[PDB]
Amino acid sequence: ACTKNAIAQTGFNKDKYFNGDVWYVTDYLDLEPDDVPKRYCAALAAGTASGKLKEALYHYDPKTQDTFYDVSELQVESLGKYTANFKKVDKNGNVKVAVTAGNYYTFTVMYADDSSALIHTCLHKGNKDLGDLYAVLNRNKDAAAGDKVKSAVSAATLEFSKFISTKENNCAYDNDSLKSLLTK
Numbered sequence: 001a002c003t004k005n006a007i008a009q010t011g012f013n014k015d016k017y018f019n020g021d022v023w024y025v026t027d028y029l030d031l032e033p034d035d036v037p038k039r040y041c042a043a044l045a046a047g048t049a050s051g052k053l054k055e056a057l058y059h060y061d062p063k064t065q066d067t068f069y070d071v072s073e074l075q076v077e078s079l080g081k082y083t084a085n086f087k088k089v090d091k092n093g094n095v096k097v098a099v100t101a102g103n104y105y106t107f108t109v110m111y112a113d114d115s116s117a118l119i120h121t122c123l124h125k126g127n128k129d130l131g132d133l134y135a136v137l138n139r140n141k142d143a144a145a146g147d148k149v150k151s152a153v154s155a156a157t158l159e160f161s162k163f164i165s166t167k168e169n170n171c172a173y174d175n176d177s178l179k180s181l182l183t184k
């Protein structure tokens with residue numbers, strides 16, 4: 001179940017966030033913690049491609065080696081708050097699971113600056129969801145969370161100390177695929 005109406009950053013700068021570059025998940029918190037593994041790798045690219053607002057996602061379970069990419073077209077609900085219907089693709093953008101009704105996620109950018117961000121997502125895959133999932137992002141895959149984003153976590157009435165880090169999982173990412181998937 002998802003339970004939070006995440007508030008987007010006041011003054012969110014969409015063009016900076018959606019600049020075509022990659023964001024790495026460095027830390028995450030699911031309010032239903034058993035919905036996701038305790039060790040995980042994830043990253044995304046976010047950009048406009050030929051006028052269309054896009055995200056490309058990468059997920060990797062470093063223990064099971066379960067790997068998948070997704071491409072999403074985002075619709076705007078309000079500044080910094082989106083609804084994304086996804087298609088599962090291979091790394092080259094070939095469709096494995098087409099877009100469908102019931103497969104979507106909400107995506108809210110709660111905090112962002114040039115190097116860091118705090119997001120919320122609620123994933124729906126038919127009548128299943130993956131709970132309220134918060135993620136701390138950085139442009140540098142190895143960056144420890146700094147005070148701007150940790151303060152944003154606090155401002156969301158969350159505690160950064162409860163977030164699970166992705167840093168001890170030997171995560172390795174194909175940035176080229178993420179960037180190229182924005183066009184697909």
Ligand code: HEM
Pocket residue numbers: 025028035036037039040041042043044057059068069070086087088097105107121123125130133135
């Ligand atoms: C950064 C933001 C994220 C977004 C927007 C997001 C989005 C999604 C989407 C769209 C899917 C479905 C993929 C498909 O079936 O084609 C998915 C699945 C999944 N995500 Fe995330 N995700 C994010 C971060 C994470 C993180 C950090 C974890 C942490 C553990 C995670 C764990 C999972 C798992 C375990 C699944 C598989 C669900 C199932 O098998 O049905 N995700 N995610």
